[PDB]
Design a protein around this nucleic acid. Structure first.
Ligand SMILES: [Mg+2]
Ligand SMILES: [Zn+2]
Lengths: 349, 96, 158, 263
RNA sequence: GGGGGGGGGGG
DNA sequence: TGCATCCGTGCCCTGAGGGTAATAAGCACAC
DNA sequence: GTGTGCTATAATGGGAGCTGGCACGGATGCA
């Protein structure tokens, strides 16, 4: 019955669709190509978007189960519109009915081919284990590559299907591994750079008989590489650690039990800031109301924005020269008060 | 730990001893003003260095952590008053 | 960062709650990162495991389903019927809330049919489109297992 | 026909054509109907006895089945198969849960409560307890099926730069990453109209991903960090146990203004 | 029906 | 009623250790 | 620098079973 163990279930399911003989494969590919040509013909005839007719025929052949919005279609996909399109296509004369029949058969042929060629995906994916992704994820990405290969396969060239399908399955698996295997994402070109660098380091360790220094690696990489670039690449390729890992050999003490919180201010720091605000208010209360307002509007103690001299002068209705002079004399008073009282020295940190 | 300049652990048994002594305010200090009550501990330090008495303790941060983690498990935990009307412990930051 | 947008256009409390157009980040305290939740919109509903594997299962008890049956349905091992649509299986009409295995569901939904390969050079006894009963010999080495119409797939010779 | 213009078989003159030596023979439990004029129904459509098939209503179907139009043979086949409504997994479970009438079930369980037998009475009692809890609580049963998973705030699963320059992460980020990956892949596979096996496997692994996110190791093997055997820490394992939230951070704490020394 | 376990010291 | 299987529990605080781990082609346009 | 496409001998069911030293209570199937 295979309770749990999804891989056994997947294998037993894919083992129920029979393998294809060559003539059946050729006929299915011919049906798919003819159906695509028929869809193009219907697009020309009815003057509609080929993807629309394609999705309508696919929905009809699949059944009422799968209805949902298509990213490419501009109109929303609902049963009303698909019934409208089905009735519009069922109103055409006798001659064009054969095109609709061929398209409806080609969709089923495509489904049968995609179902038939899944164990090839499984066999290609079985060699990618251990690179950060689980087996079933690789299987599904290979299945997507297989679907694309089924779309792109041309049977006129007399080549077997697996020959063209393997390329797409392999490329899909590699792209998925390069895109999704890391917690912090690295672009695919940089991933290829990391892999090439690791390969070069492995080779140089093999010949040299010891782990090479950065300069030897950079020399082996060729032009454009120096030791600093190799060190930077190695620094880039590092994977984070989990806070829930046991540091020693315990199972109760972990890595996060020793990481401090540097963001939120400590009580000492918050108290220092509060005392600084209170002392600044007390010192400014030794000034006049207007000259305190001037500096508060200039520094950001009021409303939090640093106002220009023109803005404060307009607010007080005075000349920018007058606002500058009163600001300067207020700052002189502040300097005198701090020199006489010494209440802000220790707050310079 | 000594190396991290940390503090002593007031475990379950110490809380049981405090409860058996009937010392409610000392226990409430241990649970809030001396750990994971940010506003409470900041105001307590300010009041002490100003010579005043420490203020009223507030909701611990670990209770908010527990509430959010339970909301992550698709469970709705609500704090209710005597009339069963909702009372917010996040002062509106977590509510749109 | 407290009271500061991502792009740095709004960097203090003079805006509080205002949403930056460039980065889309609301200007509030940083501690809101401890409280605000998100969500993931699944394309297929999923059962909460607490109400499935906590004996006795609450969903199973409500639906009068045993643990094995609920496990088989939830993790895709058997079907469950919501509307019989007048179907009948092995002479017994299908009743609602019955469990069908994949072969039974397929023979109900898409019909039953089989494909018999013939050895090379051996000609078919029956002709194309001819009705055939179970056990009737379609080829010297082929014995039919179901009564139904027989069709040619690929004739080598014209 | 052939791929190339040559090797095509064009009739020399008037005659008849016969086909011999099939590669294989398919036996299908179906009803055949020849037709002359235009056919009303295309392939894949399902018909009921009496539904019009072709010839503008002259020929009609006698059996519930699926229409298979063979244009080569100019024949409409009806493969005997029904439109039975059967579903799988949490979608079917939720559909069933939305159709429950708790009052009628309460009445039925109250009737069963009076049966003489011990076991039947006890089972009815348990079921009625659950039903009455749902009734009085005001919680719809279908809410036990999730349609939109909630996402914990980042600061409770932080991505923090350690002093040495490295990064430290929580396992919850990995579980959420797996969930999002599988959900997006499901959406893409649905957009492409993939066969049912692929969609079924994807839905099953999505269910397993949600199960691991909620309670890792409850069913099957726990998900582990690549190249390691240490299970990831789900939401369930943080709340329970000696190292859980309750006992470690709520029933006991670490306090300020404290010291220690030898006595 | 098919794979277990947190090292050593102090009190 | 008597067996069989699965899940849940198993003392408290503190110190020092010191943690990072076996890889499949790339190249061409585009912005 | 990063995101995306594609390529044409033929290839068509993984990982091997890294195995066994806690023990008792309870709760439900299953006789
Ligand atoms: Mg060099
Ligand atoms: Zn911004």
């Amino acid at each position: 019955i295979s309770t749990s163990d999804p891989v056994r279930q997947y294998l037993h399911e894919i083992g129920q669709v029979p393998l294809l003989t060559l003539e059946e494969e050729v006929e299915l590919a011919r049906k798919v190509e003819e159906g695509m040509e028929a869809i193009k013909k219907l697009s020309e005839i009815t003057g509609l978007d080929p993807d629309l007719i394609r999705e309508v025929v696919r929905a009809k052949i699949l059944g009422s189960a799968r209805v949902r919005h298509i990213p490419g279609l501009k109109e929303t996909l609902d049963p009303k519109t698909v019934e409208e399109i089905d009735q519009k296509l069922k109103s055409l004369p006798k001659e064009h009915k054969r095109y609709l029949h061929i398209a409806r058969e080609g969709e089923a042929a495509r489904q049968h081919l995609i179902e038939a060629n899944l164990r090839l995906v499984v066999s290609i994916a079985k060699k990618y284990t251990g690179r950060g992704l689980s087996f079933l994820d690789l299987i599904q990405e290979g299945n997507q590559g297989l679907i694309r290969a089924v779309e792109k396969f041309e049977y006129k060239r007399r080549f077997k299907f697996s020959t063209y399908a393997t390329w797409w399955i392999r490329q899909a698996i590699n792209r998925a591994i390069a895109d999704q295997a890391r917690t912090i994402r690295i672009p695919v070109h940089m991933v290829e750079t990391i892999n090439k660098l690791s390969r070069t380091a492995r080779q140089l360790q093999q010949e040299l008989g010891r782990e090479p220094t950065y300069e030897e690696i950079a020399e082996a990489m060729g032009p454009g590489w120096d030791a600093k670039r190799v060190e930077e690449t190695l620094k880039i390729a590092q994977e984070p650690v989990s806070l829930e890992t046991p540091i020693g050999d315990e199972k109760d003490s972990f890595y996060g039990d020793f990481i401090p919180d540097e963001h939120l201010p400590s009580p000492v720091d918050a108290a220092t800031q509060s005392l600084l605000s209170e002392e600044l208010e007390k010192a400014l209360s030794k000034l006049s109301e207007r000259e305190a307002m001037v500096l508060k509007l200039r520094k950001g103690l009021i409303d939090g924005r640093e106002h220009t001299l023109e803005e404060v002068g307009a607010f007080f209705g005075v000349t920018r020269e007058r606002i500058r002079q009163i600001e300067n004399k207020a700052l002189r008073k502040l300097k005198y008060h701090e020199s006489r009282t010494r209440k802000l020295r220790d707050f310079l940190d | 730990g000594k190396a991290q300049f940390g503090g002593q652990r007031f475990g379950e048994m110490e809380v049981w001893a405090l409860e058996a002594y009937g010392a409610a305010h000392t226990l409430q200090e241990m649970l809030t003003l001396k750990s994971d009550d940010i506003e409470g501990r900041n105001a307590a330090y300010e009041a002490i260095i100003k010579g005043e008495d420490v203020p009223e303790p507030s909701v611990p941060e670990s209770f908010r952590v527990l509430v959010k983690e339970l909301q992550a498990l698709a469970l709705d935990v609500q704090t209710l008053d005597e009339k069963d009307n909702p009372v917010d412990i996040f002062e509106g930051l977590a509510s749109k | 960062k407290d009271y500061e947008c991502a792009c740095g256009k709004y960097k203090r409390q003079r805006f509080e709650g205002k949403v930056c157009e460039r980065c889309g980040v609301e200007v509030t305290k940083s501690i809101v990162r401890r409280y605000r939740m998100g969500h993931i919109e699944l394309a297929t509903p999923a059962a909460h495991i607490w109400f499935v594997k906590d004996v006795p299962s609450k969903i199973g008890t409500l639906l009068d389903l045993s643990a094995t049956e609920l496990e088989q349905v939830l993790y895709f091992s058997k079907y469950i019927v919501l509307d019989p649509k007048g179907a009948i299986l092995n002479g017994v009409p299908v009743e609602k809330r019955q469990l069908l295995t994949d072969e039974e569901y397929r023979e109900l939904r898409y019909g039953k049919q089989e494909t018999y390969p013939l050895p090379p050079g051996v000609d078919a006894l029956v002709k194309d489109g001819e009705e055939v009963v179970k056990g009737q010999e379609l080829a010297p080495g082929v014995v039919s297992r179901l009564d139904g119409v027989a069709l040619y797939r690929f004739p080598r010779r014209v | 026909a052939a791929i190339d213009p040559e090797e095509e078989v064009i009739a020399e003159a008037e005659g008849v054509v016969h086909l011999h030596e099939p590669a294989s023979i398919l036996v299908v439990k179906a009803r055949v109907y020849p037709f002359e004029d235009d056919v009303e129904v295309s392939t894949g459509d399902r018909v009921a006895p009496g539904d019009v098939l072709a010839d503008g209503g002259k020929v009609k179907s006698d059996v519930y089945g699926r229409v298979e139009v063979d244009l080569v043979r100019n024949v409409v086949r009806v493969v005997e198969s029904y439109d039975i409504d059967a579903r799988m997994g949490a979608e079917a479970i939720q559909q069933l849960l939305k159709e429950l009438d708790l009052e009628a079930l309460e009445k039925e369980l109250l009737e069963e409560m009076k049966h003489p037998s011990r076991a039947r009475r006890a089972k009815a009692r348990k079921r009625l307890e659950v039903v009455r809890a749902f009734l009085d609580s005001g919680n719809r049963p279908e809410w036990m099926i999730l349609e939109a998973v909630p996402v914990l705030p980042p600061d409770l699963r932080p991505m923090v730069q350690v002093d040495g320059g490295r990064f430290a992460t929580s396992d919850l980020n990995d579980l959420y990453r797996r969930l999002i990956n599988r959900n997006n892949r499901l959406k893409k596979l649905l957009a492409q109209g993939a066969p049912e096996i692929i969609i079924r496997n994807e839905k099953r692994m999505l269910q397993e991903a949600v199960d691991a996110l909620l309670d890792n190791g409850r069913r099957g093997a726990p998900v582990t960090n690549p190249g390691s055997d240490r299970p990831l820490r789900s939401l369930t394992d943080i709340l329970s146990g000696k190292q859980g939230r309750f006992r470690q951070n709520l029933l006991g704490k670490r306090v300020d203004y404290s010291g220690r020394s030898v006595i």
